[PDB]
UniProtKB/Swiss-Prot annotation, chain A:
Protein name: Chromatin structure-remodeling complex protein RSC6
Its job: Component of the chromatin structure-remodeling complex (RSC), which is involved in transcription regulation and nucleosome positioning. RSC is responsible for the transfer of a histone octamer from a nucleosome core particle to naked DNA. The reaction requires ATP and involves an activated RSC-nucleosome intermediate. Remodeling reaction also involves DNA translocation, DNA twist and conformational change.
Family to which this protein belongs: To yeast SNF12.
Superkingdom to which the source organism belongs: Eukaryota
Further information: Present with 2470 molecules/cell in log phase SD medium.
InterPro entries reported for this sequence: SWIB_MDM2_dom_sf
Summary of subunit composition and partner proteins: Interacts directly with RSC8. Component of the two forms of the RSC complex composed of at least either RSC1 or RSC2, and ARP7, ARP9, LDB7, NPL6, RSC3, RSC30, RSC4, RSC58, RSC6, RSC8, RSC9, SFH1, STH1, HTL1 and probably RTT102. The complexes interact with histone and histone variant components of centromeric chromatin.
Gene name of this polypeptide: RSC6
Record lineage: Eukaryota, Fungi, Dikarya, Ascomycota, Saccharomycotina
Organism: Saccharomyces cerevisiae (strain ATCC 204508 / S288c)
Cellular compartments annotated: Nucleus
Swiss-Prot record, chain B:
Protein name as it appears in the record: Chromatin structure-remodeling complex protein RSC8
Miscellaneous notes: Present with 3380 molecules/cell in log phase SD medium.
Function recorded in the entry: Component of the chromatin structure-remodeling complex (RSC), which is involved in transcription regulation and nucleosome positioning. RSC is responsible for the transfer of a histone octamer from a nucleosome core particle to naked DNA. The reaction requires ATP and involves an activated RSC-nucleosome intermediate. Remodeling reaction also involves DNA translocation, DNA twist and conformational change.
Subunit structure and binding partners: Dimerizes via the C-terminal coiled coil. Interacts directly with HTL1, NPL6, RSC6 and the N-terminus of STH1. Component of the two forms of the RSC complex composed of at least either RSC1 or RSC2, and ARP7, ARP9, LDB7, NPL6, RSC3, RSC30, RSC4, RSC58, RSC6, RSC8, RSC9, SFH1, STH1, HTL1 and probably RTT102. The complexes interact with histone and histone variant components of centromeric chromatin.
Subcellular location: Nucleus
Organismal lineage: Eukaryota, Fungi, Dikarya, Ascomycota, Saccharomycotina
């Protein structure tokens, strides 16, 4: 899960500006898409796969003379041990698909059950042996919001040129409907709520409360 | 003197909106003050 942050990470980079007055905006879109393709190639090579130790201080382990018959070697890392043991369980077709233990596995495991899960098999196997990019991504997302602000002011004044009668009545109604919201919490301030001046709808409320 | 179909139709209509035969008792609903504050009310009627 991705961690939530306290600052905006990206911006939409609006596209309602006239593409015949402001130029090179398509250049910006091409550059952003190219950077979006220049890191999909990096994240891929961060999950890169490598095959460097099929067979090839605590990285080297001496195997027992018993397990040395299922490996072909007497020393090597633990990775080679678990891998070659799995390869031996796979080549001889021992998994039940119609693990069924072989004859030499009886000795290497010191078990006569002749049938054991693979989990226990590898259990016995063990038993036998960066900062500047954040500033750049905040500086860029600090300009695509300034662009997203100037574009909004252009959108407002351009939509004011066309239909000014429609925008002005909206501004006057937003004003007459927002100056009322901001003047709704000036009644409770602890220096005008104990002076008995606002207690002489705070009277029908006590009727509803007492009934409640 | 209206036909029965219309009489029952208008009666069920009036009863649907609770204008007549509204089942209600005022002992379970408390009083309250409406948004309209106290004032001075009059009802104008045509001369009989």
């Amino acid at each position: 899960n991705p961690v939530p942050v306290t600052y905006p990470t990206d911006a939409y980079i609006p596209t309602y500006l006239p593409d015949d007055k402001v130029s090179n905006l398509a250049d910006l879109k091409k550059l952003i898409e190219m950077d979006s393709r220049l890191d999909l190639y990096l994240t891929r090579r961060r999950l890169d796969t490598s095959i460097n130790l099929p067979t090839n201080d605590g990285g080297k382990v001496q195997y027992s003379p018993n397990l040395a018959t299922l490996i072909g070697m007497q020393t090597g890392s633990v990775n080679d041990a678990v891998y070659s043991i799995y390869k031996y369980i796979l080549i001889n077709n021992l998994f039940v698909t119609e693990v069924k233990l072989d004859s030499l596995l009886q000795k290497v495991l010191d078990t006569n059950a002749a049938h054991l899960p693979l989990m226990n098999v590898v259990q016995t196997v063990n038993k036998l042996v960066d900062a500047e990019d954040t500033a750049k991504l905040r500086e860029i997302t600090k300009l695509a919001l300034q662009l997203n602000s100037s574009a909004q002011k252009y959108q407002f004044f351009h939509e004011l040129s066309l239909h000014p009668r429609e925008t002005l009545t909206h501004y006057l109604w937003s004003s007459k409907q927002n100056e009322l919201v901001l003047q709704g919490d000036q009644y409770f301030n602890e220096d005008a709520a104990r002076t008995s001046d606002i207690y002489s709808s705070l009277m029908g409320n006590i009727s509803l409360l007492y009934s409640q | 003197a209206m036909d029965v179909a219309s009489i029952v139709k208008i009666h069920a209509f009036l009863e649907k909106w609770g204008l007549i035969n509204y089942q209600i008792d005022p002992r379970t609903k408390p009083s309250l003050i409406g948004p309209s504050f106290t004032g001075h009310f009059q009802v104008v009627l045509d001369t009989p």
